[PDB]
Design an enzyme around this catalytic site. Sequence first.
Site, PDB file in Angstrom:
ATOM      1  N   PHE A 169      39.688  49.316  43.529  1.00 38.77           N
ATOM      2  CA  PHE A 169      41.029  49.218  44.047  1.00 38.77           C
ATOM      3  C   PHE A 169      41.920  48.220  43.687  1.00 38.77           C
ATOM      4  O   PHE A 169      41.755  47.533  42.639  1.00 38.77           O
ATOM      5  CB  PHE A 169      41.052  49.315  45.706  1.00 38.77           C
ATOM      6  CG  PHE A 169      40.090  47.924  46.082  1.00 38.77           C
ATOM      7  CD1 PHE A 169      40.694  46.647  46.543  1.00 38.77           C
ATOM      8  CD2 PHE A 169      38.757  48.057  46.473  1.00 38.77           C
ATOM      9  CE1 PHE A 169      40.016  45.704  47.027  1.00 38.77           C
ATOM     10  CE2 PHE A 169      38.120  46.927  46.891  1.00 38.77           C
ATOM     11  CZ  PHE A 169      38.719  45.850  47.030  1.00 38.77           C
ATOM     12  N   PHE A 195      42.976  45.252  42.837  1.00 40.32           N
ATOM     13  CA  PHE A 195      42.389  43.829  42.665  1.00 40.32           C
ATOM     14  C   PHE A 195      41.147  43.525  43.287  1.00 40.32           C
ATOM     15  O   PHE A 195      41.239  42.195  43.678  1.00 40.32           O
ATOM     16  CB  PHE A 195      43.477  42.788  42.437  1.00 40.32           C
ATOM     17  CG  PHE A 195      44.980  43.350  42.053  1.00 40.32           C
ATOM     18  CD1 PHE A 195      46.086  43.323  42.999  1.00 40.32           C
ATOM     19  CD2 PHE A 195      45.039  44.010  40.756  1.00 40.32           C
ATOM     20  CE1 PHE A 195      47.198  44.187  42.551  1.00 40.32           C
ATOM     21  CE2 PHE A 195      46.055  44.535  40.476  1.00 40.32           C
ATOM     22  CZ  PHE A 195      47.228  44.406  41.082  1.00 40.32           C
TER      23      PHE A 195
HETATM   24 CU1  CUA Z   1      41.801  46.642  37.976  1.00 41.10          CU
HETATM   25 CU2  CUA Z   1      42.619  45.607  35.819  1.00 41.10          CU
END
Ligand code: CUA
EC number: 7.1.1.9
Lengths: 550, 166, 33
Positions: free
Chosen positions: B84, B86
Site C-alpha cells: 500500500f 508506503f
Molecule cells: Cu511502494 Cu515504491
Amino acid sequence: EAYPEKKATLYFLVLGFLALIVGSLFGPFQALNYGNVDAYPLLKRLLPFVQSYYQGLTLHGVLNAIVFTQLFAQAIMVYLPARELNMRPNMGLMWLSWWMAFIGLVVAALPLLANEATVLYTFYPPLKGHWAFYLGASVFVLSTWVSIYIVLDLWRRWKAANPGKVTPLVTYMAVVFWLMWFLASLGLVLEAVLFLLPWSFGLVEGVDPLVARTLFWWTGHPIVYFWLLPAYAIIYTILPKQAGGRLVSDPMARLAFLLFLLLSTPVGFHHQFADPGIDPTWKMIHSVLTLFVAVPSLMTAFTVAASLEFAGRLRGGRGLFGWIRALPWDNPAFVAPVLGLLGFIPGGAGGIVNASFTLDYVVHNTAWVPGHFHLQVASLVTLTAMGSLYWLLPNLTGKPISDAQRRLGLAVVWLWFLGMMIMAVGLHWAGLLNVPRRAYIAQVPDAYPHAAVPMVFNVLAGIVLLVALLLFIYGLFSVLLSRERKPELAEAPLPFAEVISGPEDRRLVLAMDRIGFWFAVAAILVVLAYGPTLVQLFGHLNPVPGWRLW
Amino acid sequence: DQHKAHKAILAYEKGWLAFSLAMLFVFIALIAYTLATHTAGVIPAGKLERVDPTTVRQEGPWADPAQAVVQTGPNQYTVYVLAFAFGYQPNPIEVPQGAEIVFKITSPDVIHGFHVEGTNINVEVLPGEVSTVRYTFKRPGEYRIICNQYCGLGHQNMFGTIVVKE
Amino acid sequence: EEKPKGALAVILVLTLTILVFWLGVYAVFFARG
Ligand code: CUA
Ligand code: HAS
Ligand code: HEM
Ligand SMILES: [Cu+2]
Ligand SMILES: [Xe]
Ligand SMILES: [Xe]
Ligand SMILES: [Xe]
Ligand SMILES: [Xe]
Ligand SMILES: [Xe]
Ligand SMILES: [Xe]
Ligand SMILES: [Xe]
C-alpha cells in the site's frame, strides 16, 4: 533557397540539444543522490519550482530519453537519405514534423514544470498525471508519423526515377528504420488513444494497469532501437570515412537494419518478467527473441571494428594495438562515437543478462538498470550526437570550427565518457547490493550501509559529469553565437564513407531490398507474439481508480 | 590490401556469427535449467487472478492482517501480503524455514515492488492483480523488503520485514 | 589485407565481457536461489 531541408534539420537539432541541456542538469544532482549526498536543497535555490526529487527525474527522463533522442532521430534519419538521393523532402510535411514536435512539447511541458505530471517517463497507471502531459506527448510522438511518410515518399519517388536499380545505402537504412518504428509506435498509440486520453479527460474513471504497461513495453523496447540506429547509421556510413578508412561490407550493414526491422518489436515482454498475469511460456519465447535482436549488434561489433582496423592500417597501423593509435584521435567527430562504442561493450553485456528471464529477478528495478542504459543511450547514442555536430553543424550552417573549439571537443567528450564509466561501476555495484532505482535514497542515509564504496563512485561521477555538462553548453552556445558564415563548406557534401563492392554484393543485397515482403514478415511476427496475450488481457479488463501522490 | 579484405571478411563474419549463435544457445539451455529446478518458483504464475482494490482491506484475505499467515499444505504456508501507500502489511511476516512460502500480493492504490533482499523474490505488485510467487527460505533470520517501483513521494521510505523462524 | 587481428581481439574482449557478466550473475542467482 539552395536547401530548405537544412533549416528543419537544423531546428530539430537545436531544440533537441536544448532538451538535453535541460534534462541533464538534474543528472549530477541525481548521481549525487545515489552517492548518499543530498544536493537538492542546493537545486531549490537555482530552481524554486523543483518541488520533489521525482519531479526532476520525470523531466530528466522525458527531455533526455524521449525528446532529445527522437528529435535527433528525426533529424539524422530524414536528412541523410535525402541528401544521399539529392532529391528534396516535402518541406510542407517536413515543417509539419517540427511544428507538431515543438507545440506538443510545450503542451506536455507545462503540467510537468508546474508539478502536475510527476509520474516519471514511463507513466504507469494508476499514477495519474495532468491531461496536458498525456496529450502533448501523444502529439510529439505522432510527429514521427509525418517523418515516416516523408521518408517513405522519397523512397517511392526515387523508385520511379531509377527503375530496377538497388536502393542507395543510407536510404535503405532509413526506410526500414521508419517502417519498424511505425509498426512499433502503435503500442503506445493504442494505449494513449484507447486508455490514457479518455481516462485523463474524464471519459472513463479507471485503467487496467497490466495492459497499460503491456502496450507500453510493446513500444518500450523498439523505441530504444529507435534511439540507437541513427547513431548506427552515422557509425556505418560516416565514421569509416571519418577514420580515414572505408566500410568493409555493404550487405552486413544492410543485414543489421534488416534484422532490426524484423526483431526489434516482438520482444517487449522482457520488461515484464516480474509482471503478474502473463504465461511464463510467452516470457521464455520473448526471452529467446531478445537474444536474437542481440545478434545484429554483435554483427555491428565486427563490421565496425574491422572498418576501424583497416583504416588504422592505411594510416600506418603497426601491430595488434598499432592500428588504434593510427586513428584520428584529434578529430572529436571521430573520438566521440568511438569512446561511446567502447562503453557499448559492458552495456551490451548488461543487456544480455537482463534478457535471461530468471536472471532478471537479480537486477530488475535496482540501480543496475540505470547503470546499464546510461552506457547505451547516455553514452553511445548521446556522445555520437555530440560528435555529429563537429561535422554536420558546419554542413547545415556553413560556419567553420576553430582550434580551441576542437580542443574543447576532445576535453568535453573524454570527461563525459570517463564519467559514465565511473557512474556505471557505481550503479551496477549498488544494484547488486540491492539498492532500488527511482528512489531519493539520499534522504534516507543510514539505509544502505553496505554500498558505502560504490556510493563514493557516484559522487566522483557526480562532480565529473557536472564539469563536463557545463563545459558542453559553453561550447554549443559559442558556435551558435558567432556570425562568421563561410558558405563554401555549406555546399561541400557530407563525409560519406566509401564502400567495398564484390562479386556477391548483389545476390543478398537484392534479397534484402524486398522491403514490402519483410514489412509483412515484421507485421506477422508482432501479431504472432503479442496477439494471443493481448487478446487474453482485453477479455478480462480490470480498470482501477486514478491516483496522485506528489 | 582492400580487394583482398572482402573475401577474408565474409569468412570471419560468418564464423563469428556462427560462434555467437551457440554462445547464446548455451545461455538458453542454462536459462532452461533454472526453469526446471526448484528456483523457478519466483516466476509469477500466469493465470490471471483479479480483485477489487478499493474493497480489499474489508472483503478478502487482505483485510484481517492477523490472518495473513495461513497453512495451506503439509509443509506449505500462504501469506497474504498487502503493498500500500508506503508500507507493507503485515509488518512483520513470520514464516517457518524449510517450508514452501507462497506469497500472494496485491495493491489498494498504485504499483509497488516486492524485493526481498537476499532472495530471488522480485515481483511487480499491481492494483487489481494477485501476484503469486513461491520461495523456500533455507536460512533463519530477518529479511527486508524494499519497494523497487516509483509509488509516489514516500517511495524511498517504503520498506517491509519478513522474519523466518528457527 | 591479410587477417584482421585487431577486430578479432575486439570481439574477443566483447565475448569475454558478456561471459563474466552472464556467468557472474548466474552465480548470484544461485546464491539467492
Ligand atoms: Cu511502494 Cu515504491
Ligand atoms: C539506446 C538505448 C538502449 C540500447 C542500445 C539497449 C540495449 C539492449 N537492452 Fe536495454 N534492456 C534490456 C535488454 C537489452 C538488450 C538485449 C540490448 C541489446 O540490444 C544489447 C546488445 C549489445 C551488444 C551485443 C554490444 C555489441 C558491442 C558493440 C556493437 C561495440 C563494438 C565496439 C567497437 C566496434 C569499437 C572498438 C574500437 C576500438 C578502437 C577497439 C532489458 C532486458 O531484456 C531491460 C530490462 C531490465 C529491467 O528488468 O529493468 C532493459 C532496460 C533498458 C532501459 C530501462 C527502461 C526503464 O526505465 O524501464 C532503457 C532506457 C534501455 C535502453 C537500451 N537498451 N534498456
Ligand atoms: C550528466 C550526466 C547524467 C547523469 C549524472 C545521470 C544520472 C542519472 C541517474 C543516477 C539516474 C537514476 C536515478 C534514479 O533511478 O533514481 C538517471 C535516470 C535516467 N537518465 Fe540519466 N544521467 C545523465 C544523463 C542522461 C542522458 C544524457 C540521458 C538521455 C540519453 C539520460 C537518460 C536517463 C533515463 C532514461 C533515466 C531513467 C528515468 C526513470 O527511471 O524514470 N541520462 N540519470
Ligand atoms: Cu527492452
Ligand atoms: Xe502518452
Ligand atoms: Xe512522455
Ligand atoms: Xe513530451
Ligand atoms: Xe503515441
Ligand atoms: Xe514507450
Ligand atoms: Xe522506455
Ligand atoms: Xe514512451
